[PDB]
Design a protein around this ligand. Structure first.
Ligand code: HEM
Length: 85
């Protein structure tokens, strides 16, 4: 298997609108092209760019179709040494 791994400090650098990455349940998503398409707006995503956004994502109560959309933006897994307990 060719799984690509990123450290959290690499993800932390894509925190602006020119290249926007986010972590959700331990996977890294490049959502740069989705910013303007997101139904909840681009601001709530930029506030969380470069970070683990799992709790906000789940707190909103996203639909099954929103979960499906993730797959388009998947680029890699968070290195296991950087995942918290
Ligand atoms: C990058 C992965 C994300 C995707 C693919 C995504 C997708 C969507 C989609 C499709 C909707 C429409 C309603 C639904 O189907 O549930 C939506 C609504 C919304 N999203 Fe996201 N979202 C993402 C991340 C986030 C994050 C990190 C936040 C921050 C808290 C957020 C906040 C919201 C809000 C507030 C709404 C409006 C809720 C409603 O009234 O429908 N989303 N999102």
């Amino acid at each position: 298997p060719a799984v690509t791994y990123y450290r959290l400090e690499e993800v932390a650098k894509r925190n602006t609108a020119e290249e926007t990455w986010m972590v959700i349940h331990g996977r890294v998503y490049d959502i740069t092209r989705f910013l303007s398409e997101h139904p909840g707006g681009e601001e709530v995503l930029l506030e969380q760019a470069g970070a683990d956004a799992t709790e906000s994502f789940e707190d909103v109560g996203h639909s099954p179709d929103a979960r499906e959309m993730l797959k388009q933006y998947y680029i890699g897994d968070v290195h296991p040494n950087d995942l918290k307990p």
